[PDB]
Design a protein around this nucleic acid. Sequence first.
RNA 1: AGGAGGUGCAUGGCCGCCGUCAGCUCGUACCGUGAGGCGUCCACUUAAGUGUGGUAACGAGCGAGACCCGCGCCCCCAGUUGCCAGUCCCUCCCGCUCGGGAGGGAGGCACUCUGGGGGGACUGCCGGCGAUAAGCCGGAGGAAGGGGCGGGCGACGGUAGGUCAGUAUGCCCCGAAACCCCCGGGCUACACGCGCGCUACAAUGGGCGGGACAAUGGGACCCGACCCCGAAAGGGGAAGGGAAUCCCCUAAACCCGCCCUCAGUUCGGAUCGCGGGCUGCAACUCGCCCGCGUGAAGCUGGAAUCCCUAGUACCCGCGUGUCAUCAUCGCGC
Lengths: 55, 195, 99, 214, 68, 149, 135, 64
Amino acid sequence: AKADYNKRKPRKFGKGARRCIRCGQYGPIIRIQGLMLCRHCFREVAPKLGFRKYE
Amino acid sequence: AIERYFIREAVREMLIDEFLEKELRRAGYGGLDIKKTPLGTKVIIFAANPGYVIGRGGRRIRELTRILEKQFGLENPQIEVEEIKNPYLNAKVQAVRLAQALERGIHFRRAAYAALRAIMNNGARGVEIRLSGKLTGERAKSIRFYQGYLAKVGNPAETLVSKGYAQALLKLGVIGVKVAIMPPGARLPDEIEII
Amino acid sequence: KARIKIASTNVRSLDEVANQIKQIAERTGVRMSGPIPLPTKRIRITTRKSPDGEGSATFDRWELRVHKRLIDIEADERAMRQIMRIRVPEDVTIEIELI
Amino acid sequence: AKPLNERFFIPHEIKVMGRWSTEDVEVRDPSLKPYINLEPRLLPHTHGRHAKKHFGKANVHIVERLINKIMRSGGSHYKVAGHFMRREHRSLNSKKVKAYEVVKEAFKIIEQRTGKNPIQVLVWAIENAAPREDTTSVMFGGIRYHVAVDISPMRRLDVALRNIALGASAKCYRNKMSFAEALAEEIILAANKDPKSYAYSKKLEIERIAESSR
Amino acid sequence: PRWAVNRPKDYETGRDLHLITAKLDMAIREDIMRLRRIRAYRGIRHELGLPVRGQRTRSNFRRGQTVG
Amino acid sequence: ATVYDVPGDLLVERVAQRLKEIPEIKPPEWAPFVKTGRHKERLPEQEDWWYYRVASILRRVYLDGPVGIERLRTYYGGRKNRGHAPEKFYKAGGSIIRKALQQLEAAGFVEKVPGKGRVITPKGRSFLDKIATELKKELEEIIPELKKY
Amino acid sequence: MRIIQTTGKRKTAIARAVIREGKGRVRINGKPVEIIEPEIARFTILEPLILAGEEIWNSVDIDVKVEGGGFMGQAEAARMAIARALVEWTGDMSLKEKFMKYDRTMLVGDPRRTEPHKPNRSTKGPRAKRQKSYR
Amino acid sequence: GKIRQGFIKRVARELVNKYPNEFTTDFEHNKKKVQELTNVTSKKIRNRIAGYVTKLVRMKMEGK
RNA sequence: AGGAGGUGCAUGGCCGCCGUCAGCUCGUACCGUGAGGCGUCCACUUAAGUGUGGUAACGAGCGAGACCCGCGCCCCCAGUUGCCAGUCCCUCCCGCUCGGGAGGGAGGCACUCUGGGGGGACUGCCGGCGAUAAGCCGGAGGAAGGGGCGGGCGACGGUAGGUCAGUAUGCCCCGAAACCCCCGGGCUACACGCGCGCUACAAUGGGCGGGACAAUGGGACCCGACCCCGAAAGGGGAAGGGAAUCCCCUAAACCCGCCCUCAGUUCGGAUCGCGGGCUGCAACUCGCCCGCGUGAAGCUGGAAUCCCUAGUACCCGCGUGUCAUCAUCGCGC
Ligand SMILES: [Zn+2]
């Protein structure tokens, strides 16, 4: 019965150092401008964030 | 850079909107507006039921102020609540209300027709309501009820038409509700009149 | 002299602030440099549409445009007092520098 | 190597490459005469601008057409002289300066060897390498039939130029002979009607097949 | 220069030596034999004839003929 | 005349030939055993490539001055053969450029501008311009069109 | 003195030309046109002057500054700028007609620009695509 | 294909019926009059309406 | 509670395909006992159910078009962090300076450029065809002639197509285990078959020295000029830059001079040996870089098969996404 265990070691780099602020996923995190969002979540919140589709 | 500030503000606002949408579902949440003041910030919440938002004695509103200050990093926030400009034109509010009715237990066809006729009567160019899920059996289906004039493809469709989506959780699964409303006074590029 | 850097998302609010500054300088009686439009910043992010890997790969190019204007105004008590009294809408960020 | 007066050649008259004039060049084929452009032109480089217009190649100088035909690899989906010539990273594809230099050196070699105008020799080679008849399939009833057909001057010129370029590529492929020397030899042989020329051999083969079909 | 020789640091002597022909083959064979004798992973790979520098063997390095 | 009035390669080779008389310009002790960049495959085949490189660096300082070691390195770099990997651009070495610039400064042709790089002294400008004038005078007979320049 | 400025654009290359009375000195980026390499680019730059004539060439001075593009785009832009400057300086409608008949692009710019790339092997080009497998 | 749009045709016909003497065979004048008389906000649509108005005026003149 | 445990044959959302295909429906009337039919058919035309005319149909809705972003030409406004053509001052160099060139200053915005608002192109006019209509072909003028060019926007429905392993979610299941954390290993194995590519089988070249010309984007535990130390990798100090101010950033293909001269070679660069570095807590499984050394198939490819119509294809490099380090990859230039 120790609380020293069941805790996650701090990590300053790697896939486990970044999680989506909406999901917690460890995969395709977008850090282009500090967004820290999944490629799935960005597709959903781009209109809310103000991004549009001029091209 | 300078765009980092815009990105951070947009992300914070989107997080605030999502959390408020989750928390105040029964209050007919219709959005929020955030204004910056030299002493802090003011958040105005659009709601059709201020009673639930403020609560009895303001416990909910003080808790919301505390959580907005502490978890969202907003500095000195003050919260105000005010009415929806048009609940029958706000697509998100209508979708949430239809999902709540489905959860309550009204028949899907009756509830959809009631919402359609209410929105039609309260003034609109066109309405479309799509219900998708395990309706009438274990095999999923999608049913659409439409009235009036609506646009689906193009810039006028993306701009004028207001869309909303809701999820109704029954005892058998989730049902998706999509509501698209064309507000009155919207003029298509085709519509040209002689002076 | 004072340098005003105004950056926003919508050119209409940018132009409203710029016109406010131009009218305020015209009534104020100072030598003001015209609004210099700096190059627009276009943040472009290309993302895969599908959440899975099946099917033909398709991408969408989300874009966010930030417009910037620069104004130079000669220093004056009532001038830059009225300048600090600008309405400064929400979607516009304004920076003041003294040189 | 090259003389300085040639490395820094400065033309003063409107003539092909600043060295040769087309005033005395004569085309005695009425079919190909209107489609061989010999207007006074100094630099044979129009940067395209003729593919958009139908029949637009009739206003392009013959030297530029030869340069464009030379600017290639030699063979990708067909075999010339029984071999593929797939040169990917070491081809003249999209190297107009290299094609221009090769054509200029070939013209100089042709002039030195013949004593006549290199453009005149090229015109003679094109005339002697342009086929006059071909064969094609026509579907009448419910089945096809191979019949002999005439060839438009446009296609005649195109085939002649392509055959000359292919013959030059084959002669220069994997031998001590250079591309310019191979092109000059091919042009001279085609002008002199010698069967060793790839263009003339192909013209004879096509005409014989058309005669057999008709 | 000391950085242009064949053996910039000899295993035994520690001097900078340049070897040609029979000496070079003998030195390379001795290094491989030392790896095999100490039973290193590189020695195992040298013995088996498989690539030694951590390459992927699923789709390439196919020396044998088709089977099945 | 001026450096702008003559072709680059002829002027570079003439300046390299002239530079052999300057005692300051001396090849380093490691010159015979080094390559002129990581992207290069074989040693130089001139046995006097040091003077050519010094002349090229001097002309570059004359033209694009002030210039620095890193910018000269990215100028002198080039494409590399990476085996099965696709070709890629790489920068050149720094020791050769630094030694050449130091030798030029010792000879008095260039001088350091702090925080900006190295510029050409009036002596170096005259040294380049005299050779350029001689080259243009030689070229005038072959190309009469250069007389008006 | 009478100084006339003209501009030429080809692809991403922009050339600004200044023409004035002189002794036939034409310089591109401070370098005499006679020592311009390669020969194809030198001919591209020199064609309008040859068309204009020896006397007009020798009784005028042109200075051209070109930025952007490649060695051929810069040559085309310089050629267009020089042609426009010559026409404006001479005011010769016959010369303008000769230029138009010889090459329309000398007086009228080239609208052609690179087409943006599209997915399915974007790095290769707008229309180039990955090879199909079918099995 | 350059097929005139139905609403363009309808607007042009209504304009030519309501103001018969305000439109001539001159495209520039017709375009100016169309811009002044109707609330079209797109230059391309205004030009198309003006062109069809000019065509209809020419047909009315020659007697179709 | 928790579950990246089963179920995508229970679902929501999103995505691929039919398909940017031209289709999918409604009000009333009319036909047929009825399922259904008409309109939505016929002739011509269009990329289009896009239009003209006839008609037991008359009128509509969603699609298409319209619409939105960018490119090419011109005009007005604006002149800094952007630009330097004319005028003035200073310094330096050349053929000794008649003349020419370079840099720094004041100064200007004239040109380029940046970003706001407008103009222009609409089958507008001429000839012909079609029927005089819809429309089509050619030509004049024009920066741009016929959807101006390239994109975004994917209809009613289906495909029990893929996704519960991105989030949400019903049932079932584990529930002290299938839940949570840590050390080590594996996803990187290797007789073989296959798909996408990179490198080449050389002279339309290989090596050496020299000479030129870009754009898109990114930069705070970050990009880093500049100086010094090293043969290279790399190491030490450090100006400026939250960016039209500083940096990544003096690309390659291309051109000139020399060597090689048709050869498994001065082609080709896998495969190994020794040594030197970078990142990281850790580099053997299982990272990347440089120096010397060795130098395997490969000398043009059967049947078969893929992409592309204008700045397109081919060839040549660069930026960014992933990233402490790693790009033969995706997206762009
Ligand atoms: Zn997420």
